[PDB]
Design an enzyme around this catalytic site. Structure first.
Site, mmCIF file in Angstrom:
data_model
loop_
_atom_site.group_PDB
_atom_site.id
_atom_site.type_symbol
_atom_site.label_atom_id
_atom_site.label_comp_id
_atom_site.label_asym_id
_atom_site.label_seq_id
_atom_site.Cartn_x
_atom_site.Cartn_y
_atom_site.Cartn_z
ATOM 1 N N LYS A 252 0.850 -1.189 0.000
ATOM 2 C CA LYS A 252 0.000 0.000 0.000
ATOM 3 C C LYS A 252 0.885 1.238 0.000
ATOM 4 O O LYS A 252 1.562 1.521 0.994
ATOM 5 C CB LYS A 252 -0.933 0.037 1.210
ATOM 6 C CG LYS A 252 -1.871 1.260 1.198
ATOM 7 C CD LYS A 252 -2.117 1.792 2.599
ATOM 8 C CE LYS A 252 -1.323 3.059 2.902
ATOM 9 N NZ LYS A 252 -1.797 4.278 2.128
ATOM 10 N N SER B 120 5.592 8.822 8.602
ATOM 11 C CA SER B 120 5.698 9.780 9.693
ATOM 12 C C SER B 120 5.721 9.090 11.050
ATOM 13 O O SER B 120 5.216 7.975 11.216
ATOM 14 C CB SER B 120 4.541 10.786 9.638
ATOM 15 O OG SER B 120 3.294 10.147 9.845
ATOM 16 N N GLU C 65 10.393 2.538 9.684
ATOM 17 C CA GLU C 65 11.308 3.624 9.329
ATOM 18 C C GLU C 65 10.592 4.959 9.490
ATOM 19 O O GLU C 65 9.740 5.305 8.676
ATOM 20 C CB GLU C 65 11.825 3.465 7.895
ATOM 21 C CG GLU C 65 13.156 2.733 7.790
ATOM 22 C CD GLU C 65 14.261 3.400 8.604
ATOM 23 O OE1 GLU C 65 14.233 4.642 8.761
ATOM 24 O OE2 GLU C 65 15.153 2.678 9.094
ATOM 25 N N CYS D 83 14.115 11.805 3.879
ATOM 26 C CA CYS D 83 14.147 11.374 5.278
ATOM 27 C C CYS D 83 15.436 11.861 5.943
ATOM 28 O O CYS D 83 15.478 12.089 7.161
ATOM 29 C CB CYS D 83 14.023 9.851 5.388
ATOM 30 S SG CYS D 83 12.400 9.202 4.883
#
Ligand SMILES: NC(=O)c1ccc[n+]([C@@H]2O[C@H](COP(=O)([O-])OP(=O)(O)OC[C@H]3O[C@@H](n4cnc5c(N)ncnc54)[C@H](O)[C@@H]3O)[C@@H](O)[C@H]2O)c1
Ligand SMILES: NC(=O)c1ccc[n+]([C@@H]2O[C@H](COP(=O)([O-])OP(=O)(O)OC[C@H]3O[C@@H](n4cnc5c(N)ncnc54)[C@H](O)[C@@H]3O)[C@@H](O)[C@H]2O)c1
Lengths: 472, 474, 474, 472
Positions: free
Chosen positions: A188, A245, A266, A300
């Site tokens: 997804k 997030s 992560e 990131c």
């Protein structure tokens, strides 16, 4: 009108995309859930539509993936590595148009879109060899006639949730390693990168179908929040890999733990650069510029906090200001451009708010701070000085090019200030002092998982270990 | 009157124990929290008392441990291993009395009490060598003049929560590996094995003190749920290793995750034995007996479910009934007993509850099922038949010698039945069919983390944090 | 007239081959030594010629390779792996014609010729990933502020001597792993597969040249014993990988040791199959047949000795005689043949010699044993019975399809008989007895380096040199 | 009269030694070969006698070891590690007297004798843990239903030949690792350290006998050249570990290769120190002194060649000369002493010859160069300057404290001079230049196996690997 309906974007059809696209793949293509339109952030124009998974689609897909696993888990790892090799080659063939789609839908510049597809290719090339290295030792038992075997098996179904900013290569890593490990996958992606998810899945699906393998080995269920939460709560999803997030990731991790599942999280966070008095500014400035403004500050690893020694603070800020000015800006898929838009309108709002909150906390905007007067989601790369290290806005992770600059006098304090951050993803130091580098890399140093200075058993994460004792 | 005050128990003083003991160690001994008296389960008499940690004790100890870490983390891994070696030697020196204490306070037979201390000794001997093996590779970067270093560092403070049934060796494993990895530790043992925790800590403390190292490297805060919960919620506890019940462990796991800490959970689970039609009964019967009643059925690995083919279900039960008749139950210090008392009076109540509940659900008690009429917490080794493989009492892990037996027809049946359980701990199969064995151990076989066939070295990474360090040396 | 000059062989030009080919590559192509014409063993017609290395060619090449190494060793391991990846892609592009050449010059059937090139391709794909894994650990020193680094460096120049029977893939393995390890290579293939060596080198050379790398990273000096001996005695050849006969290999091994160099020797040895009384004959017969006659009995791993229990010796031989009758022998390009010609006319003579010598030592030829009356080097698949397990001809490894069969009574007998041979290459057993299998694979079992049961990742360290580096950073 | 017959050396009897000692152990003690007397190098007095192996003793012992192996190979590796643990503890109990014997018979100072026994103890402690780590992975096959197993088995009988200068710990390493790997061993030590060999073997034999194990698991055959050669040529010796001189070792390696056996060769050689212009002399001088004169220059790692930058050459030589003067000298087992005798009279002869040949090649003796006028094999620690780097005497490895000093001007030349040495065992550089250290440690740097800057699968060497493919 949809971009995909304009002749100038006819190249999109080379990825098998049309006006409205199926967003579910489980060996068959479908989608009975909500229809989403994704937009090009460089001009806010609609590109095409994707019909997402319904609850029923999700349920069906999970069942079909788990049935496919019965076949897939029986294919020896090196033969699974061959399938991953073929996925790599298939990406190779589509790298320019797929990279172009990454720039179009996500907004990162073309060299970065193509580079992200190349990363997935490189990952596949790596996985091929790694597939021959999967296994555990037979250790000697304390008892005669007994064998001690460290056995590794697939976990089963690996659900993969990915984010907008690397909409191809994070999935790519998870997919490639989970596949050679004998797992099936369920993807997804970010709803705002649905066309990219569909395009990648079409490439993989053809490789699987050409090899007479059940397509659900690499299933796709495009959807929003309810699909992600379903995966998190689903006992049939043996391992859930989440990238995104911290707020969402924390809740995903708690949901997985509640049902005794496994997760890989992560969550990113704040990234700091520390330039000491003896740093080579010839490295610091271009490093800080690239780490701050690259991908419009939406990585990131994006540098959001720059700590500079009092002595060189002003010079570095000046040279950064000079460097920021010569940044080339345009449509991200135009090979000329170096700086593209933010991914959404919402991010532009977050940018403006962050700038305002920074001023209201006492900071001075020494460059940028404004939205650009042009179509799309373009904002000026921003440098803020005068903020205090404990500033609330600075600790928050806004996906926008805002560089917060802090001064310091000595090593002791700046190290303390940084070790006061929890979510720290990476730390980049610039210094020539060797003792200092050791202190920062050692037990009393940075808590970050990634440390940069002046700039293998990964498969076990996707398998379950058992200790098997056998009596001859 | 306290056993430790009686002349025949004077050997307890060899472990530095007294009538009332300090239950907090952080370089100094103390304890301002609630007293706890522990009891010998063989006769239900009080042994001695331990003063547990108050909130202030806990705070002071966590602070002292973190200060101690500043020194300890700077000591080279092989030098840390030499300390752990000396801890093993010190345990050796006390193995008989420390083993006897495990038997006295916890209730397992003396060969197992001594054997548990020996396991901690063997772990220390192992850790000495492992300490010279800790580190990561330097890899070439794709970029010339750059180096990629896999760096491993201590996590900091490792909190260790342990259970009553292995009150020495679980702590020992965690302590020994955490230590060589450059961490400091904080121990909260089971309240009912508080004397054992104090005795082990006294042994380690002397080694640390003799070596002029801050004792809070191996801190102790005796307490119950409140200390355990504090550790779970405490951000200063970088890694929390928990061993115990699934219910408690799950809460601990969620609390640690809520603060993004790290945990290691050992929550156990059920243990099943599967004897197929082609099983060697010469193996099946004794293996099942010892697995079922060893340590009075109080091991994490205790076999509580025995599936037998409809073929031989009748016989194996008969041969088990006869063998069970010859099990000798008695005092843990008696060299000729197979097992001793249950750890607590409450456990005896749980035993009777499970036995009655089993009957209400259709089960036949084909042997045992009674409390023995003698002082202490003694129960008969028990076998129950006629239950369905989904009976809610048989899936309950009762820490007592209750063996539930089920019949089955086909392999597909028993394998489904067995992998219907939520992450069991161990599966032990008895069969000759080698294809069945490959099946059961393979991707479509048992989900247990421990699988045994015809019987009932990177571990240090769990206690450290990895970083990828890229260094531009150009 | 040369096959390569005939219109139907025009595809050979796709491999850059001509009537007379240069057999030396060091960045430029040349060759001032003796010419050699190689022949197609299917029809004994000359294919084309190769000019081999003179002493001056060899000297110049070793010098150029060592100069090339100065550049290559500075290229990061993962970048070296990308070059090897491109070599694999380039082989892929030519796989059908390069496979056809292997079949044309060496004589193995086309599926094996293509399959051999595919193996080299798979090796390159493997090497790409392995190149990111090369390195050693940083370990903590016992001394504070000191670091212990396990450092791995290229050995320098890796000489590679290969044999006729796998004229592509053995070189491929050595070349690919040596390359990612930062070494340069010098290849001397079998003289009778010189065109194959040139063709492979042309493919690699273009990749190197296209990447603006000195071609002598993968040098070629075609020659015979004189070049091979030069390499063995040459101090500039840091590591010598040899594949071939035990007699030659032993000499090579001694020469390298005399100069304290490093060698990797693959000398083969015999391959035995042992079918016990409880063996599944459904497996035994076809496994033995394919193992015995695959590549016309010219593999290092070719099964040449089949021990069968006295029990079933009679039947398996009968079922083998019937199966052997259905083996189709013919042209390597014919998709419906199991094997083709022997590699040389001399090999045909060796076949007839072994057959007669076997008879003189009491053996019965129960099938085959004759040369086929047709052009090329074709012999019948042969089975010989009645020999003793110590018969000097059966221990000779004749590269031809000759299968010697022996009966035996007990396991102890056949195991002694088999471990009487001097370091055999492979042992393949067929049995159900699992204890016998543990025995045979265990410390008191077979001494072979390859053991198979019911069937006929640190490798890079072999190509590098380890140093322990201690650095005082205090 | 024998030292062991004098009351002052009665402590020798604590090691089970007597006037004449059996030098063969194979489960029984014996020796029908030549009787050797060993001598104390500090006073040239006879210590005691050892009756060495005859040919027949050797033959019998090899057969008995190989019979013992049938039992030993069936003991699981961790239980073999327990036996090695017990050997460690037994050495611990005897460490002072055994260390004293090392000083007495071999000549190294007491702290080094004891330290060598401690090294063996540490090795045993290490082996215990390593014994639980022996094994290979089960790798996935390309074919379904097939298992690929990397199997490790003992080689069988490991013959161990050791030298005078580390008469305990080299055997100790080989023995401990070979034992946990399931091999039996056969030890032939230096004839001039026969009492040490016997004493160690008595300690081990008691551990084996206490555990009801066949003593021949750790067999001893004291002897001279003919025994070593027999081992080298013996097909029943599956692996031969040799430590000693290059000339003998080369011939041993060739003999082993001739019979297709396995060997492990430690041949030592020349060790160089390189002090660049920027070196910290505070480290260089004491480092060079210890590396040069430690164990009277009889270490495999002894520094014999010192390269110094022209700038600091004279200062370093001066400070070395000053340092050499304050070296304390006496009986090596007296806790006061820092410098003992050479191991034999023959070494004193080699020392004098080396000094003479050095002068005849053009070198100046700036310190020492003389035998000391006292009982024993004492010579003055010597520094020679003015020699050319290509000097023949300098390249030869005389086991005596002679430090050859060479000057250089730049990095390029001194690196070349050193890479012109083949037998190089270790290289020690002193410099603060980082680029230079990298160059010296990297592919274009030192060829030595041991490199020092400013100062794990070992078990596989004693086992044989097989690839086992199993079809379910
Ligand atoms: O078997 P149990 O799980 O009830 O106990 C195992 C261990 O966890 C401890 N414990 C009990 N309740 C706890 C809680 N709420 N939080 C943390 N630890 C707890 C116990 O004191 C014991 O040491
Ligand atoms: O099968 P073979 O061993 O006769 O040949 C194997 C390889 O070794 C080479 N070779 C033949 N004689 C040699 C020698 N004396 N020294 C080194 N290599 C030699 C061959 O040319 C071939 O490449």
């Amino acid at each position: 009108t949809l971009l995909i309906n304009q002749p100038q974007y006819a190249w999109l059809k080379e990825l098998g995309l049309r006006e409205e696209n199926e967003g579910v793949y489980n060996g068959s293509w479908g989608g009975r859930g909500e229809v989403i339109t994704t937009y090009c952030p460089a001009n806010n124009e609609p590109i095409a539509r994707v019909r997402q998974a319904s609850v029923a689609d999700y349920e069906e897909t999970v069942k079909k993936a788990r049935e496919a696993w019965k076949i897939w888990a029986d294919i020896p790892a090196p033969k699974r590595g061959e399938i991953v090799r073929q996925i790599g080659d298939a990406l190779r063939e589509k790298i320019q148009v797929l990279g172009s789609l990454v720039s179009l839908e996500m907004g990162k510049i073309l060299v970065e879109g193509v580079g992200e597809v190349q990363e997935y290719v490189d990952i596949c090339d790596y996985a091929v060899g790694l597939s021959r290295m999967i296994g555990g030792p037979i250790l000697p038992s304390e008892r005669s006639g007994h064998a001690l075997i460290e056995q590794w098996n697939p976990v089963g179904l690996v659900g993969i949730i990915t984010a907008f900013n690397f909409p191809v290569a994070v999935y790519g890593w998870n997919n490639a390693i989970a596949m050679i490990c004998g797992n099936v996958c369920l993807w997804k992606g970010a709803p705002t990168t649905s066309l990219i998810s569909v395009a990648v899945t079409k490439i993989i699906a053809k490789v699987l179908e050409d090899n007479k393998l059940p397509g659900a080995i690499c299933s796709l269920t495009c959807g929003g929040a309810d699909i992600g939460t379903a995966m998190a709560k689903d006992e049939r999803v043996n391992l859930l890999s989440f990238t995104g997030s911290t707020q969402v990731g924390k809740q995903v991790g708690l949901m997985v733990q509640e049902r005794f599942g496994r997760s890989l999280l992560e969550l990113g966070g704040n990234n700091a650069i520390i330039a000491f008095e003896d740093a080579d500014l010839s490295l610091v400035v271009p490093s800080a510029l690239f780490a701050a403004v690259g991908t419009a500050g939406q990585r990131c690893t994006t540098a959001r906090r720059l700590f500079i020694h009092e002595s060189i603070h002003d010079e570095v800020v000046n040279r950064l200001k000079k460097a920021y000015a010569q940044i080339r800006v345009g449509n991200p898929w135009d090979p000329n451009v170096l700086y593209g838009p933010l991914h959404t309108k919402q991010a532009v709002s977050m940018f403006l708010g962050a700038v305002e909150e920074a001023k209201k906390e006492g900071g001075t905007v020494v460059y940028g701070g404004k939205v650009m007067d042009r179509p799309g989601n373009y904002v000026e790369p921003t440098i803020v000085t005068g903020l205090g290290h404990d500033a609330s806005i600075a600790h928050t992770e806004t996906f926008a090019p805002i560089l917060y600059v802090f001064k310091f006098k000595n090593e002791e304090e700046v190290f303390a200030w940084n070790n006061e951050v929890k979510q720290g993803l990476s730390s980049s130091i610039f210094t020539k002092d060797l003792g200092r580098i050791f202190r920062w890399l050692g037990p009393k140093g940075s808590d970050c998982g990634i440390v940069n200075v002046n700039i293998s058993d990964a498969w076990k994460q996707y398998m379950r270990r058992s200790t098997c004792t056998i009596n001859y």
